[PDB]
Each structure stands twice: as structure tokens, then as C-alpha cells.
Motif scaffolding. Structure first.
Motif, PDB file in Angstrom:
ATOM      1  N   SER C 169      26.954 146.729  65.118  1.00  0.00           N
ATOM      2  CA  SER C 169      26.892 145.286  64.904  1.00  0.00           C
ATOM      3  C   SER C 169      28.313 144.746  64.885  1.00  0.00           C
ATOM      4  N   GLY C 170      28.674 143.984  65.918  1.00  0.00           N
ATOM      5  CA  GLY C 170      29.986 143.361  65.940  1.00  0.00           C
ATOM      6  C   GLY C 170      30.194 142.399  64.789  1.00  0.00           C
ATOM      7  N   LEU C 171      29.109 141.804  64.288  1.00  0.00           N
ATOM      8  CA  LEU C 171      29.213 140.932  63.124  1.00  0.00           C
ATOM      9  C   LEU C 171      29.746 141.698  61.922  1.00  0.00           C
ATOM     10  N   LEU C 172      29.231 142.908  61.701  1.00  0.00           N
ATOM     11  CA  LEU C 172      29.731 143.730  60.606  1.00  0.00           C
ATOM     12  C   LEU C 172      31.188 144.107  60.826  1.00  0.00           C
ATOM     13  N   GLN C 173      31.560 144.397  62.074  1.00  0.00           N
ATOM     14  CA  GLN C 173      32.948 144.736  62.371  1.00  0.00           C
ATOM     15  C   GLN C 173      33.874 143.579  62.025  1.00  0.00           C
ATOM     16  N   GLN C 174      33.500 142.365  62.429  1.00  0.00           N
ATOM     17  CA  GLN C 174      34.322 141.202  62.118  1.00  0.00           C
ATOM     18  C   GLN C 174      34.342 140.914  60.623  1.00  0.00           C
ATOM     19  N   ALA C 175      33.216 141.110  59.935  1.00  0.00           N
ATOM     20  CA  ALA C 175      33.191 140.905  58.492  1.00  0.00           C
ATOM     21  C   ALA C 175      34.126 141.875  57.785  1.00  0.00           C
ATOM     22  N   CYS C 176      34.115 143.143  58.199  1.00  0.00           N
ATOM     23  CA  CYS C 176      35.023 144.121  57.610  1.00  0.00           C
ATOM     24  C   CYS C 176      36.474 143.786  57.931  1.00  0.00           C
ATOM     25  N   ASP C 177      36.740 143.321  59.152  1.00  0.00           N
ATOM     26  CA  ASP C 177      38.101 142.943  59.517  1.00  0.00           C
ATOM     27  C   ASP C 177      38.593 141.778  58.667  1.00  0.00           C
ATOM     28  N   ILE C 178      37.733 140.792  58.429  1.00  0.00           N
ATOM     29  CA  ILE C 178      38.138 139.607  57.680  1.00  0.00           C
ATOM     30  C   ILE C 178      38.301 139.933  56.201  1.00  0.00           C
ATOM     31  N   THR C 179      37.259 140.497  55.589  1.00  0.00           N
ATOM     32  CA  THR C 179      37.297 140.770  54.158  1.00  0.00           C
ATOM     33  C   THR C 179      38.156 141.978  53.816  1.00  0.00           C
TER      34      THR C 179
END
Ligand SMILES: [Zn+2]
Ligand SMILES: [Zn+2]
Lengths: 36, 299, 261, 358, 208
Positions: C169-179
Motif C-alpha cells: 500500500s503506497g498510502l502506508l508508505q507515504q504515511a510512514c514517510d510523513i510521520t
């Protein structure tokens, strides 16, 4: 206080001008106006 | 203030003598009495004490603090021209007037009509141009006669003592004697009534509506007298809180700050609906009609 | 005063686990539940001040899950097993909704964290982090709401750790990158617990001295609404921020004509 | 020229950049400066606050400042006349200031009709039948100074009616429109729900066999018992360690090289200079773009010519300087990419212009 | 640690702000916030002419004072469409600042243009690749210290400018380099959450 479903400032160029006068040393807000 | 002296002064019997009290949803007037200076000097404007240096210096300090605190619109009514000129000269010599000039621009009226007109024009221009302007006049002067102050002009009106007329005019003394011999009126009582009338005329012209709010200052201990204080307009005397009776310069400054901050907040006319402002429907309410009937008082 | 909270969100989609069960692979839902329970027990073990929160993400709703063994650990495991069996036994598929309520579970977890922090005394500071295991496929319509979650965590500075099992899930990847949380896909599902312990168990301060695999590369491409294709430079609407590949006089979404004389 | 030289000296990097752009004939000074190209209000305290500084060692520090004198002139034009009529012949400036201090000048211690025409406020102006001097002088000069300051701040029945309307009108009993807003309502709100995320192959499951799988897993986990040994094994543990071991698949890459020592600091600084130069050149190029007027075509052509000249006269010597050291860093590659991107952009726009004309 | 001395100059500050914002694109809003401590301002020229110029420039001005209400500030806020506020305390100060954080309602005269933006990715160059050519970031280049000489980062899709920080508009080509989360970060403004119905617990005959 939400207004109606209206257009807003999507792109904003905000300039903040702050006084540097003698009265900035007053104690209206602790410790003075400048620090707060 | 007196509803019975006029039937005696005018020698007639009016059919109706009714006073309409003022009802405000938002307090627009802040009358305060400061009979004590910074040095706890008993502030008075008796001609014996009018020449006192301490009273002059306390007045200068009060004006300086008010200028440093209160907004541009400042008007000061003295008791006589000579006393005002002497006080101004003393302030210049002391140097207190210089700090007042540093804070706000000052304009002093003279006996010249053209000079006074120019002073008024400059005062209004400075007040509307964002620079503090202070006007100095007399209770018997032309300013107190036919000049009206808007909300941004009547920000602060300061009366320096009860304006008792200089009694040396035997015409005034003869009038007092005639009134006493023909209407059972004490001369001192009439003098108090006239001085309070002049003070109210000087002060009463600073409010032009509900949204017009101003500051009222009376710098004299003699105002605390029940006979003198009781000779104030009902719409003003009622709002004169006893907690503000005989305050000090710093206490007056703090109360002025509080009142200005409270009344500078944005306000909506809708809040006045049903409380201080009546619409077409609200007036038709019988309860509102009974309240209106209760508002006025006939004497 | 270091109160570490490790909220765990479990992808409890019955359909994906049914597919895996039919595949008869070594790893099942029972192993996932056991690994999660063991990880939570270890987290509570590491310090008294540590707290554990377990919420199961299911299509119908998000469920607040929470003899020779520790009393509190045994009680917590019993409660978790009871709740998960109650949910799954009564989990009746009524509707075509297949994508799990991932965003709702995250929102409930954030609300729980906020409530705990309010209940936390000023004497102690409660560091909070969230670990999420991804098993089923990702959801599309939740995306925007999902974004509303991410910054919210970044608003309170809460790490979000993603543990992809099968579906990336790219959404999870971006969430981990941001947070700042950790993203990693488990290569061998039976080895899940060690991946949880070796990587996601230590706290960020512990992670600081620790040496860990570098974060995965994350892309931030865009979809051109008229075709939803990958786009490098696009035309952004000043009204509703809709992006278009070609110049348009009127925006389809905001329905406001671009007043360009 | 002198002002330009001083300004260039104030920014030696720009001065070096100006030299490298002009002396190398890359750009002309005209084209160089083509894109290259405080009043204080009057305060009323300028008299009382400003005092002759009486330093204890009998020092009369006047601290003569231009702004103070300008404020005095603006507030008191008479002082300007006195200055212009005395110095430098009749008297010196400092003596004039000292005289001003000693003189009594320093040590002094209606357009609107309704509410200004005090003489005309009364309709019955009949005859008179029905330290006072110091105070009057002080009041008059204070009022004069205030009027002068107010005037320096700036530097008919219609008016009467407007003033009366402003005075009489009440804000309460007027209008309170205040609706200077435009409502917005988009057409399709579903665009944001799946936003810039591209289309994903979110495949759906099969027919009722999906429900069969759901029932199977529901029954499988309906009677569940926790396990401990089955959770992990040493072989799985060994595999996990190996993946987490240094050099493993999870440990992507590893150690890197010290780029700092690979390039001299002088080469780095020259690279910074070239970066700034090319960046400003391309910034002007993109500022000209898009070419909406015929004049812009010539300007962009000149921009490209300047880019070519700068490249040839600096990067090629810079390329040779790097190549002599045989530096392995492709710093020149970034510059080449930018230059080729700009050149291709201009060539493509020229092709579009040719196509539109034909 | 500044030196608080002198008096404020509304004219000079507003003129500088207008000169800075004189060349801004029409679609971008031009809003100015002013904090006014002293009640006296010194004007080297007329102020109302500057007000007319600002109104012609469609530049919004908001004022939050500290002492009391100033007529000139009130006129400036009202004429230019801004809001004038008075600080009661530090809490009210924070409330006013928070209210000014949110985007203001758009004016009728505000344009709606189709602005073009690029969305580069975090292109990181690895020394395992032979094309790992570092280049000093433009933002870091204009710095006193050593600019960030990183192998990769964000490269402009329009002019191949390299930036190590986002969201930053491109210096060279003027492209607004943003990221997808940045756009979605303000979607709550587009879709505000309405206030919930407060009901007493006794009158709420439902779940507890
Ligand atoms: Zn649109
Ligand atoms: Zn660019």
C-alpha cells in the motif's frame, strides 16, 4: 466559526508587520508585548 | 437634574414633568471621580486651592497617564481661562506638558474665535489621522456651547473640578439675593446647580448612540458630595458606580483600560433586539409596553 | 515518567484470511493473533509504565480488543481472544463491502490515544506510537480520509509503523514517510513475530542507537482526473485544486470557468 | 559608472560574475544590467527629546544629524530661512545652533462649516451693550508648532451636506450587508476520495465461492486455541537474522564514499559560481517564456546565445580542469542536463512557432 | 532580543509590503496582517492615498491591536475588507491568531486561473549507480555554510533545478514544486466538519 461553503484563500502571500515602538515594552501581556 | 427648579426659575407650573431613564444593553459611559492624586493629595478646584502647585502637578500627571493610555480623543474642561493658562504655564515649567506633547498632539483654545476654530479643525484632523489630539477649553467657553463630539472624538472628557462661577460679579450675587428673596432658593444651592449643569453640558455631548461609547472623568473630591453628586443627570448619575467614587490616578487608568478593552470588542445590533432595541414585532409585545411605561418617571 | 503506548491495528478482513486458508499456507489468522498478543505482552514486559492498546480492523466495524503465566498478561490475552472470537463468530458478510475500514480504525486509535493522554497526569509524558499490519488489499475511497488521519498523527507527533504481509500500500508508505514510522513488508509470514520484535518493538529512542534497514523509496506521482494517469507537471485548479493534463477553460469538478482573458 | 562600480564592489561574487560575463564577451553590460535594475514622518518630540549632550568633561556634544535638521526645517521653515541667510558667510553653523539654544526660541519656558465657524455659530452678534502675556505667547507658539507638524504630515454646499450626513447618520439604523463572499459548490466530490492516487488493479473476488471461503475461515477461527511453539522456529529465526544481518536484503546497499575529498573545494566553489550564473540566466529565460510577444523571441535568442557563450568560455575550461584531475564526479552532467533542457525547450518552441505560421 | 524604540510607521511598512506584492499574480491572494502596539503613527506622506492604492491593488489588510480601537486602523481594515480586532489577553491573542490562520473568504474580484505546477519525486542517487552525480541544492546554495552536496533529492521537472526541501517554488522557472499530501492537507477547508448536536445525558435516550 465556520462560514458558508465559500471560496477561500487557496494561495496566500501573508506579510506580518510588527511594531517595534517604545510601547512594545509595556506589560499588557507578561512579560512584555515583545516576548509574548 | 432638578425638575422643580425650572418651574421656579421660569415661574410656571408645567403640565407634565417626566424623566426618561436611559436603558443600555451595552454600557457606553464610564463616569469616574478621582479626588485623590498619586501623592494622595485631596484634589479640589476651590479658588483657594486652585493656585496650589500640588493640584496642578497631579492634574498634569493624570493628563499624561490618560494620554499615554486613552485613545486620541481627549477634551479637558477647566473652571476659568486664567486658571487654565496658569496651569498650562506651570506644566510647561515643570516639563510634564512636554511628555504629553510627546505622546499626543495638544491644542489649546484662546479668546480669539479664529484661533479656536483653527484649533478645533486641527484637533479633528489629528483625531481622524490617527495622531492623538488633546483639546483644552473652559466650561463656559464656546466649545461647551455648540460643539458635538462623535464616538471617535468624544473618547475622553475630563472635567477639572466643579465649575463654580467666579462670584466677584455682583450681578450674580444680586441675582442670588433676588432668587432667595423671591423663591426661597439658597445662593449656594443655585451655584451648585449651575456648576453641575455646566459640567453635564460639557460631558453630555460625548455620546451619539448605543454604539457611541466614551469616557467621563471628574477630577475633584468635591464631586463626592451628595448635594453635588445628586445634581447629575439621571442617565449619567445612575451609571456612576459607587466603586468608582473618589478613585486615584492609577485606579482611574486601570478602570479606563478595562472599559476601553470591554467596549472595543466587536458588537452586533442583533444583541440589542428585545433588550435595548425594539423591532416591529418586539414593540407590539404587551410586556414590552409595560416595561416602556415603567421606564419613564413623572415627578 | 516515560509512558510508551503501542496501539496495534490488525487487518481482520475475513475474505483475505479465507483466501489464505484455502491456500493452506503455513501462516493463518491464528498465528497472526498469537504474534500480536506476544508482541503486546513483550511491550508490557519492557516497562511498568508501558501501555497496550489493541483494536481489530473489520469491515463491519472496528473492535476495541483491549497458570504459569503473568496474571495481567493472561487476563489481557483472555480478553483479546474473547473479543476477537465474538467479532469473527458474529462477523456475517451482509453487503459487497470488501475493503476494510482502515481509516476508521486509525481514527478510533487516535481518539483513544488522545483520551489516554488527557487521562495521563502532567507528572509523566506519554510517548505514543501505532503499529499496523497490512494483509488484505488497500482501499481507494478511504484515501482522502486516510490523509486526514496522517497529518492528525503528525499534529500530535505519533509514529505510524506499517507491517505489510501480502498487499503493498503506497498510502502506508507515504504515511510512514510523513510521520516517521517504519514501513517493511514481511518476506516470510511464519517469521512475523521476530520482525515485530527485532524492528517494530524497540522505541524510537531505542531505534536511534539501533541499526535498522533503510526506509523504502517512496514516490509521489499524481493522477490526472480526466484520465487518472501518472503526470509530472499538471494544471492545478485555483478553485477546487483539481489537476488536469491539458489546459481547460472550465473545471469539471468545481464547475467554475477559468477566467483567463 | 561609479555607482555601478561601487555596487559591484559591494558584491564581489557578482563583480566576479560580472567580469566573467562581460570581459569574456558572454553578455554586454547593457544586457547585464537590463534585468539587474525611505522617508521618515515628522515627530512632535524632536524638540523636547533632543537636548545638547552635556558630557561631564565640559563636552557640548551637539550630535548634529541630518535627519534632526531636516525635521527642524520641515516643522520650522523659519529655521531654514535663518540657516540660508547666515551660513557660511554671516556665521558658522555651530554658532548658530548655540545662539538658538541661548535664544528664547528654544528656551520658550475652517474648511468644515458646522462645528468650526465659532464666529458664525451665533445668530445674534450685537455690540458690547447687551504672567498672562507669557501664557498667551506659550499657547500661541505651541499651537503654531502643532499646526506646523500637522501640515508637515501631509508633506461649498456639497462639503457641508456631506459633513452633515456623516455626522447625523447612525450605524445602528442603517444597513449591515457584509456579504462579500462567493459560495462554492463543486460538481463531483468523488474526485478527492480517490485523488492523485493512480488507478489501482483493485480486483474483486470470485462468485459465492468467496462466501464459501469466508465461512471456511469463520469456522476455522471460531474454534481457535493460542499456540506458542508454532509461533516461531530457529530456522525461521535464522532466516530472519540473515535478512536483518549486515549486507542482507533488508540492509539495502551499505557504506558509501566521501564525496567531499573527491572534489577540491576550489572546484566546488567554482561549481557554485557556475550554478548561480546558469541559474540566473535560465531564470531570465523562463521569465521571458512563454513568448507571447514578438519582442520576446529576440530576447530568448539572445539568452540562448549568452548561455552558449558562457558554456564555451567557462564550462569547457572547467571541464578540462576537472578532467586533468580525472575527477569521477559528474558535476558537469547536471549543468549539461539543464543547458540541454533549455535548448530543447527553445528549439521545440521555435518548431511550434514555425508550425503555427505554416 | 531586538531594541524596542521609536514609533510605528504605517505608511512606510504598507508601502514596502505593497511594493513587494505589487507584482504578485492575480490568482494568489494578497493579505497583510499588522500588529499595532502604539496608538500613534508617523506618516511621511498622506496615508489615505496609500489606502486607495492598496484597494486598487486588491491587497487585504488585517489589524490586531493591543491598547484600544484606532479610527485609522478601523477604516483601513473596513475599506480593504480586512478585520480589526482588539486583544483582551494572551488567550484572546491566541484565538485571534488562530482565526487568522484559516484562509480568508475569497473576494468576488479574485481571479480563478488554471495554474500549472510540477510534482517531482525524491530522486535519490545511490553510489552503487554510476550516475550518482551530486549537485548543491539551490536553496542550500544561497547559504553561508557549505550547501548540501547530496547525490540525489528533488529535481525540477521543468529546468532540472535541484532542491533538498519541499514545498518550494522553483527559483529558476518559477514552477510551484509541491507534493500530493500538501494539496490534500487543506481538503478539510474544502469540507469542513459541522458542529455536533449537544444533548443532555438525561435527555439522550440512547447508548451510554
Ligand atoms: Zn476546479
Ligand atoms: Zn525549475
Amino acid at each position: 466559526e465556520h462560514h458558508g461553503q465559500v471560496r477561500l484563500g487557496m494561495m496566500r502571500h501573508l506579510y506580518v508587520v510588527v511594531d517595534g515602538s517604545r510601547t512594545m515594552e509595556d506589560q499588557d501581556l507578561k512579560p512584555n508585548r515583545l516576548t509574548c | 437634574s432638578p425638575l422643580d427648579i425650572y418651574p421656579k426659575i421660569l415661574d410656571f407650573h408645567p403640565v407634565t414633568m417626566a424623566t426618561f431613564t436611559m436603558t443600555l444593553a451595552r454600557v457606553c459611559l464610564c463616569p469616574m471621580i478621582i479626588g485623590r492624586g498619586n501623592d494622595q493629595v485631596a484634589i479640589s478646584s476651590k479658588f483657594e486651592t486652585r493656585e496650589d502647585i500640588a493640584v496642578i502637578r497631579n492634574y498634569g500627571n493624570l493628563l499624561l497617564e490618560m494620554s499615554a493610555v486613552v485613545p486620541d480623543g481627549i477634551v479637558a474642561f477647566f473652571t476659568s481661562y486664567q486658571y487654565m493658562e496658569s496651569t498650562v504655564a506651570s506644566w510647561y515649567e515643570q516639563g510634564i506638558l512636554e511628555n504629553i506633547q510627546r505622546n499626543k498632539l495638544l491644542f489649546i483654545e484662546t479668546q480669539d474665535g479664529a484661533e479656536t476654530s483653527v484649533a478645533l479643525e486641527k484637533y479633528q484632523e489629528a483625531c481622524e489621522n490617527g495622531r492623538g489630539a488633546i483639546l483644552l477649553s473652559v466650561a463656559r467657553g464656546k466649545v461647551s456651547e455648540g460643539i458635538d463630539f462623535v464616538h471617535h472624538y468624544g473618547r475622553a472628557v475630563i472635567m477639572f473640578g466643579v465649575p463654580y462661577v467666579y462670584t466677584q460679579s455682583r450681578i450674580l450675587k444680586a441675582r442670588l439675593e433676588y432668587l432667595r428673596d423671591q423663591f426661597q432658593i439658597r445662593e449656594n444651592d443655585f451655584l451648585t446647580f449651575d456648576a453641575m449643569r455646566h459640567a453635564a453640558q460639557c460631558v453630555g455631548r460625548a455620546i451619539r448612540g448605543k454604539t457611541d461609547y466614551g469616557l467621563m472623568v471628574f477630577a475633584d473630591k468635591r464631586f463626592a458630595r451628595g448635594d453635588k453628586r445628586g445634581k447629575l443627570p439621571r442617565w449619567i448619575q445612575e451609571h456612576l458606580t459607587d466603586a468608582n467614587l473618589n478613585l486615584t490616578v492609577d485606579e482611574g487608568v486601570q478602570v479606563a483600560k478595562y472599559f476601553l478593552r470591554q467596549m472595543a470588542q466587536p458588537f452586533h445590533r442583533e444583541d440589542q433586539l428585545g433588550l435595548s432595541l425594539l423591532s416591529l414585532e418586539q414593540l407590539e409585545s404587551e410586556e414590552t409596553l409595560k416595561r416602556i411605561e415603567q421606564i419613564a418617571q413623572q415627578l | 515518567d516515560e509512558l510508551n503506548l503501542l496501539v496495534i491495528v490488525v487487518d481482520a478482513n475475513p475474505i483475505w484470511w479465507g483466501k489464505q486458508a484455502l491456500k493452506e499456507s503455513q501462516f493463518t489468522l491464528s498465528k497472526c493473533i498469537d504474534a500480536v498478543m506476544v508482541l503486546g505482552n513483550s511491550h508490557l514486559f519492557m516497562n511498568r509504565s508501558n501501555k497496550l492498546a489493541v483494536i481489530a480492523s473489520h469491515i463491519q466495524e472496528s473492535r476495541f480488543l483491549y497458570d504459569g503465566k503473568y496474571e495481567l498478561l493472561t487476563s489481557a490475552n483472555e480478553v483479546i481472544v474473547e473479543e476477537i472470537k465474538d467479532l469473527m463468530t458474529k462477523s456475517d458478510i451482509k453487503g459487497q463491502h470488501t475493503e476494510t475500514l482502515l481509516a476508521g480504525s486509525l481514527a478510533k486509535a487516535l481518539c483513544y490515544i488522545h483520551r489516554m493522554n488527557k487521562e495521563v497526569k502532567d507528572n509523566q509524558e506519554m510517548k505514543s506510537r501505532i503499529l499496523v499490519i497490512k494483509a488484505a488489499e488497500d482501499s481507494a475511497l478511504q484515501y482522502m480520509n486516510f490523509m486526514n488521519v496522517i497529518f492528525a498523527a503528525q499534529k500530535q507527533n505519533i509514529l505510524i509503523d506499517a507491517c505489510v504481509l501480502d498487499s503493498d500500500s503506497g498510502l502506508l508508505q507515504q504515511a510512514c514517510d510523513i510521520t516517521g514510522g517504519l514501513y517493511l513488508k514481511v518476506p516470510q509470514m511464519p517469521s512475523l513475530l521476530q520482525y515485530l520484535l527485532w524492528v517494530f518493538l524497540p522505541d524510537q529512542d531505542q531505534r536511534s542507537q539501533l541499526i535498522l534497514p533503510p526506509p523504502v523509496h517512496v514516490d509521489y506521482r499524481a493522477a490526472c482526473f480526466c484520465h487518472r494517469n501518472l503526470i509530472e507537471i499538471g494544471y492545478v485548479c485555483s478553485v477546487c485544486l483539481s489537476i488536469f493534463c491539458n489546459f481547460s477553460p472550465i473545471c469539471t469538478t468545481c464547475e467554475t470557468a477559468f477566467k483567463i482573458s | 559608472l561609479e555607482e555601478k562600480n561601487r555596487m559591484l564592489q559591494e558584491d564581489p561574487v557578482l563583480f566576479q560574475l560580472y567580469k566573467d560575463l562581460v570581459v569574456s564577451q558572454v553578455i554586454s553590460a547593457e544586457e547585464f544590467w537590463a534585468n539587474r535594475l525611505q522617508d521618515v514622518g515628522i515627530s512632535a518630540a524632536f524638540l523636547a527629546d533632543v537636548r545638547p549632550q552635556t558630557d561631564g568633561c565640559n563636552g557640548l556634544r551637539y550630535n548634529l544629524t541630518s535627519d534632526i535638521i531636516e525635521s527642524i526645517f520641515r516643522t520650522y521653515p523659519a529655521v531654514k530661512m535663518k540657516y540660508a541667510e547666515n551660513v557660511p558667510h554671516n556665521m558658522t553653523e555651530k554658532e548658530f545652533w548655540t545662539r538658538f539654544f541661548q535664544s528664547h526660541y528654544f528656551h520658550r519656558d475652517g474648511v468644515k462649516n458646522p462645528l468650526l465657524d465659532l464666529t458664525a455659530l451665533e445668530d445674534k452678534p450685537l455690540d458690547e451693550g447687551y504672567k498672562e502675556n507669557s501664557n498667551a505667547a506659550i499657547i500661541k507658539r505651541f499651537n503654531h508648532h502643532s499646526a506646523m507638524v500637522l501640515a508637515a504630515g501631509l508633506r461649498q454646499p456639497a462639503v457641508k451636506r456631506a459633513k452633515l450626513q456623516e455626522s447625523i447618520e447612525y450605524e445602528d439604523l442603517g444597513k449591515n450587508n457584509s456579504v462579500k463572499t462567493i459560495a462554492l459548490n463543486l460538481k463531483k466530490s468523488d474526485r478527492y476520495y480517490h485523488g492523485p492516487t493512480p488507478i489501482q488493479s483493485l480486483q474483486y473476488a470470485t462468485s459465492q465461492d468467496i462466501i464459501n471461503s469466508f465461512q471456511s475461515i469463520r469456522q476455522e477461527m471460531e474454534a481457535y486455541t493460542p499456540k506458542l511453539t508454532q509461533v516461531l522456529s530457529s530456522s525461521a529465526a535464522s532466516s530472519t537474522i540473515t535478512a536483518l544481518s549486515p549486507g542482507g536484503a533488508l540492509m539495502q546497499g551499505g557504506t558509501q564514499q566521501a564525496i567531499n575529498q573527491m572534489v577540491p573545494n576550489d572546484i566546488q566553489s567554482e561549481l557554485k559560481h557556475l550554478y548561480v550564473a546558469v541559474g540566473e540566466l535560465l531564470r531570465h529565460f523562463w521569465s521571458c517564456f512563454p513568448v507571447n510577444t514578438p519582442f520576446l523571441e529576440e530576447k530568448v535568442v539572445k539568452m540562448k546565445s549568452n548561455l552558449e557563450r558562457f558554456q564555451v568560455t567557462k564550462l569547457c575550461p572547467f571541464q578540462e580542469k576537472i578532467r586533468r584531475q580525472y575527477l569521477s564526479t559528474n558535476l558537469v552532467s547536471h549543468i549539461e542536463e539543464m543547458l540541454q533542457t533549455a535548448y530543447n525547450k527553445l528549439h521545440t518552441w521555435q518548431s511550434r512557432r514555425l508550425m503555427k505560421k505554416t | 532580543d531586538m531594541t524596542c524604540h521609536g514609533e510605528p510607521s504605517l505608511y512606510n511598512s504598507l508601502s514596502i509590503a505593497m511594493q513587494t506584492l505589487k507584482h504578485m499574480p492575480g490568482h494568489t491572494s494578497r493579505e497583510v496582517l499588522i500588529i499595532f502596539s502604539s496608538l500613534t503613527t508617523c506618516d511621511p506622506s498622506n496615508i489615505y492615498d496609500l489606502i486607495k492604492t492598496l484597494k486598487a491593488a486588491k491587497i487585504r489588510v488585517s489589524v490586531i491591536g493591543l491598547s484600544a480601537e484606532v479610527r485609522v486602523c478601523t477604516v483601513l481594515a473596513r475599506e480593504t475588507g480586512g478585520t480589526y480586532h482588539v486583544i483582551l489577553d494572551e488567550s484572546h491573542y491566541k484565538e485571534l491568531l488562530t482565526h487568522h490562520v484559516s484562509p480568508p473568504p475569497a473576494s468576488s474580484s479574485s481571479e480563478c486561473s488554471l495554474i500549472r505546477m510540477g510534482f517531482p519525486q525524491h530522486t535519490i542517487a545511490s553510489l552503487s549507480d554510476q550516475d550518482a552525480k551530486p549537485s548543491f541544492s539551490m536553496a542550500h546554495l544561497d547559504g553561508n555554510t557549505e550547501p548540501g552536496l547530496t547525490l540525489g533529492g528533488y529535481f525540477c521537472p521543468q529546468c532540472r533545478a535541484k532542491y533538498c526541501e519541499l514545498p518550494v517554488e522553483c527559483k529558476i522557472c518559477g514552477l510551484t514544486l509541491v507534493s500530493a499530501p500538501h494539496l490534500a492537507r487543506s481538503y478539510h477547508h474544502l469540507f469542513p466538519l459541522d458542529a455536533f448536536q449537544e444533548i443532555p445525558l438525561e435527555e439522550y435516550n440512547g447508548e451510554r
